Amino acid sequence: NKTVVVTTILESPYVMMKKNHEMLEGNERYEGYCVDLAAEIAKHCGFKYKLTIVGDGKYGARDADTKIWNGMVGELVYGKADIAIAPLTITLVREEVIDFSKPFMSLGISIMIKKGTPIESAEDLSKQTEIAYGTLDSGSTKEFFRRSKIAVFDKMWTYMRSAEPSVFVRTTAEGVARVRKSKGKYAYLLESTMNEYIEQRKPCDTMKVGCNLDSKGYGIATPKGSSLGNAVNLAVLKLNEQGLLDKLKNKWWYDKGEC
Ligand SMILES: N[C@@H](CCC(=O)O)C(=O)O
Ligand SMILES: [Zn+2]
Ligand SMILES: [Zn+2]
């Protein structure tokens, strides 16, 4: 038994730097839902692990011209990591290069606006141009719009790919920031789980409108032919049945009525 390298990513409340991370070392520098999930999964698969923040800070997308993966998916495909424990969305194209456990949490694409903005749904965004909108750069949200042929989404993608300045953001925070300072002239498309978290914390200036654009899940990913495959799925399954994943979700998303 060799130390397992866990690639993950900074995204609240999945993985956050502890308040005193400066005086801490290793896996102790972090906290969050996925930090807790990793300890559980590790304990049930009987392995010691090392939490490693993805080098390029991305989830993963296959380059159009080079067909080479970046982000966490790439860490996995190119042997730089043994397993990904993060809010990584299970999608068809990712399933062709890596393997996923059964999902551990659900979500769907959603819309974030600054309170006051006149937008209630994706359709509203598609038939107007005053209010700009975009998504996280190399993630599944972006790939949902790029690949969609549904009229409204297709129309949203056509505008997004050519807007100026670029409507895509390097990180979630960046996107959330853009909404807050853009006086309502920028709406952000991100996953519901993350939308709900922001929406209920200070400054309470944003909100989620409309229903989710689709439905999917987050899964623990491993390289093709990994030896952890069965063990993590059994682990994720057990955790599901015991109701641990829900309790865990309820803890990290616990709302202080802040808003
Ligand atoms: N969960 C997404 C990243 C977030 C997003 O694209 O909105 C992924 O695995 O790519
Ligand atoms: Zn710090
Ligand atoms: Zn346990």
XYZ file of C-alpha atoms and ligand atoms in Angstrom:
271
model
C 0.000 0.000 0.000
C 1.459 3.129 -1.442
C 0.159 6.742 -0.732
C -2.787 7.589 -3.016
C -2.653 11.005 -4.710
C -6.047 12.701 -4.644
C -6.524 15.511 -7.105
C -9.143 18.033 -6.090
C -10.012 21.686 -6.492
C -10.681 24.835 -4.476
C -14.423 25.348 -4.625
C -16.494 26.261 -1.575
C -17.885 24.490 0.347
C -16.274 21.401 -1.183
C -12.670 22.275 -0.429
C -11.634 25.370 1.474
C -8.407 26.576 3.040
C -8.660 26.357 6.829
C -8.486 29.673 8.666
C -4.994 28.880 9.984
C -3.764 26.900 6.972
C -0.572 28.957 7.243
C 0.388 27.144 10.458
C -0.885 23.783 9.180
C 0.635 21.137 6.904
C -0.691 18.485 4.507
C -4.299 17.337 4.408
C -4.856 19.500 7.466
C -4.613 22.649 5.387
C -8.078 21.878 4.046
C -11.716 21.495 5.040
C -15.081 21.050 3.355
C -17.551 18.471 2.132
C -15.080 16.741 -0.205
C -12.352 16.817 2.448
C -14.732 14.906 4.723
C -15.772 12.542 1.869
C -12.132 11.728 1.046
C -11.432 10.693 4.643
C -14.481 8.434 4.588
C -13.736 6.875 1.224
C -10.090 6.378 2.254
C -11.046 4.657 5.489
C -13.333 2.192 3.650
C -10.906 1.391 0.847
C -8.043 1.091 3.313
C -5.535 3.531 1.859
C -3.542 6.543 2.941
C -3.965 9.541 0.678
C -2.484 12.943 -0.096
C -4.782 15.844 -1.093
C -3.394 17.732 -4.087
C -4.956 20.878 -5.593
C -5.109 20.567 -9.393
C -2.161 22.422 -10.866
C -4.007 24.410 -13.502
C -7.036 25.109 -11.270
C -9.548 23.639 -13.747
C -12.033 20.766 -13.824
C -11.360 19.487 -17.298
C -12.123 19.917 -20.985
C -10.679 18.356 -24.132
C -8.988 20.923 -26.366
C -10.749 21.317 -29.728
C -7.554 21.325 -31.816
C -5.214 19.093 -29.772
C -7.703 16.692 -28.133
C -5.588 16.834 -24.958
C -7.264 17.096 -21.544
C -6.514 19.729 -18.925
C -7.626 20.074 -15.287
C -8.451 17.221 -12.946
C -9.591 14.926 -15.749
C -6.180 15.421 -17.307
C -4.417 14.742 -13.989
C -6.230 11.391 -14.042
C -5.750 10.523 -17.707
C -2.057 11.373 -17.777
C -1.070 9.465 -14.624
C -0.490 12.480 -12.408
C -3.169 11.456 -9.882
C -4.878 8.265 -8.697
C -8.344 9.581 -7.976
C -10.401 12.756 -8.156
C -12.566 13.706 -5.179
C -14.343 16.925 -5.972
C -17.531 18.264 -7.486
C -16.639 16.720 -10.853
C -19.718 16.296 -13.064
C -20.343 12.927 -14.656
C -20.621 13.454 -18.463
C -20.476 11.195 -21.530
C -17.208 12.557 -22.906
C -15.477 12.252 -19.574
C -16.769 8.673 -19.226
C -14.821 7.749 -22.356
C -11.441 8.536 -20.758
C -11.990 7.943 -17.023
C -14.406 6.100 -14.715
C -17.005 7.434 -12.289
C -18.596 6.028 -9.174
C -22.356 6.321 -8.797
C -23.107 9.985 -8.157
C -22.854 11.262 -4.588
C -24.701 14.548 -5.089
C -27.141 15.936 -7.629
C -27.250 19.251 -9.412
C -28.232 20.994 -12.610
C -27.137 24.125 -14.438
C -28.686 27.295 -13.078
C -28.658 31.065 -13.368
C -27.233 33.633 -10.961
C -28.141 37.338 -11.122
C -27.562 40.411 -9.012
C -30.802 41.179 -7.151
C -32.801 43.615 -9.262
C -31.808 42.210 -12.658
C -34.732 41.639 -15.054
C -34.124 37.987 -15.955
C -36.211 35.043 -14.805
C -35.056 32.249 -17.128
C -32.583 31.093 -19.739
C -35.077 32.091 -22.421
C -35.061 35.682 -21.150
C -31.266 35.759 -21.445
C -31.344 34.407 -24.987
C -33.654 37.087 -26.389
C -31.776 40.167 -25.147
C -28.231 41.508 -25.348
C -27.911 44.241 -22.763
C -27.213 41.770 -19.968
C -24.088 39.698 -20.659
C -23.642 36.123 -19.397
C -21.073 33.342 -19.356
C -19.746 30.251 -17.551
C -16.681 28.737 -15.869
C -14.076 28.329 -18.558
C -13.061 24.638 -18.798
C -15.991 22.844 -17.217
C -19.079 20.826 -17.998
C -21.348 23.867 -17.970
C -19.474 25.336 -20.891
C -19.518 21.976 -22.711
C -23.281 21.702 -22.178
C -23.853 24.886 -24.177
C -21.184 24.147 -26.788
C -22.741 20.775 -27.618
C -26.448 21.649 -27.253
C -28.763 21.975 -30.252
C -31.827 22.944 -28.210
C -32.810 26.295 -29.753
C -32.446 28.524 -26.653
C -29.173 26.973 -25.490
C -27.762 26.917 -29.010
C -28.656 30.581 -29.258
C -26.986 31.224 -25.902
C -23.823 29.423 -27.045
C -23.617 31.369 -30.308
C -23.650 34.652 -28.424
C -21.251 33.472 -25.669
C -18.498 32.097 -27.941
C -18.146 35.466 -29.718
C -18.873 38.071 -27.036
C -16.288 40.732 -26.108
C -14.820 41.056 -23.662
C -14.858 37.302 -23.026
C -17.824 36.194 -20.910
C -15.999 33.117 -19.631
C -14.305 33.091 -16.224
C -11.218 31.279 -14.956
C -12.814 30.337 -11.649
C -16.208 30.303 -9.969
C -15.247 33.131 -7.628
C -14.251 35.215 -10.614
C -17.692 34.613 -12.088
C -19.486 35.440 -8.864
C -17.368 38.565 -8.551
C -18.282 39.663 -12.073
C -21.975 39.490 -11.228
C -21.552 41.533 -8.061
C -19.650 44.442 -9.604
C -21.318 44.484 -13.043
C -24.282 46.456 -11.696
C -26.531 43.742 -13.082
C -25.030 43.701 -16.574
C -23.631 40.177 -16.206
C -25.448 36.992 -15.235
C -23.603 33.791 -14.378
C -24.401 30.212 -15.336
C -23.053 27.764 -12.747
C -24.296 24.618 -11.004
C -27.153 24.751 -8.487
C -25.157 23.320 -5.573
C -22.726 26.235 -5.801
C -25.434 28.758 -6.629
C -27.391 27.855 -3.481
C -24.307 28.212 -1.314
C -23.453 31.732 -2.497
C -27.099 32.917 -2.470
C -27.474 32.360 1.256
C -24.260 34.013 2.466
C -23.245 37.679 2.818
C -23.536 40.075 1.011
C -26.791 38.446 -0.098
C -26.791 40.494 -3.310
C -27.274 37.560 -5.692
C -29.951 34.982 -6.298
C -30.949 31.943 -8.319
C -33.701 32.340 -10.935
C -35.603 29.774 -12.954
C -35.379 26.025 -12.697
C -32.265 23.988 -13.435
C -31.445 23.668 -17.146
C -30.648 19.958 -16.787
C -29.980 17.172 -14.278
C -26.774 15.340 -13.474
C -24.450 14.277 -10.698
C -20.965 14.513 -9.253
C -18.908 11.337 -9.041
C -15.581 10.126 -7.646
C -13.389 9.618 -10.719
C -10.534 7.181 -11.301
C -8.218 6.374 -14.251
C -9.243 3.578 -16.601
C -8.230 0.266 -15.063
C -7.542 1.755 -11.630
C -7.371 -0.792 -8.837
C -9.593 1.421 -6.640
C -12.605 1.298 -8.963
C -14.745 -1.348 -7.220
C -13.689 -0.363 -3.713
C -14.705 3.332 -4.104
C -18.053 2.447 -5.667
C -18.794 0.078 -2.821
C -17.695 2.856 -0.457
C -19.829 5.524 -2.136
C -22.740 3.070 -2.095
C -22.400 2.209 1.548
C -22.157 5.911 2.447
C -25.297 6.591 0.405
C -27.393 3.908 2.150
C -26.293 4.999 5.628
C -27.533 8.507 4.830
C -24.066 9.930 5.456
C -23.818 11.843 2.174
C -27.054 13.717 2.905
C -26.056 14.585 6.461
C -22.725 15.717 5.127
C -24.433 17.831 2.501
C -26.660 19.367 5.175
C -23.682 20.290 7.351
C -21.582 22.152 4.767
C -24.611 23.848 3.220
C -26.077 24.673 6.646
C -27.707 28.093 6.479
C -27.306 30.598 9.352
C -30.215 32.632 8.016
C -27.414 35.037 7.111
C -29.764 36.424 4.448
N -18.712 20.665 -12.014
C -18.162 21.204 -13.290
C -17.461 22.539 -13.050
C -18.428 23.683 -12.726
C -19.152 24.254 -13.951
O -18.805 23.926 -15.103
O -20.082 25.052 -13.758
C -17.198 20.232 -13.930
O -17.008 19.125 -13.367
O -16.673 20.580 -15.001
Zn -4.844 32.269 3.091
Zn -17.605 5.509 7.474
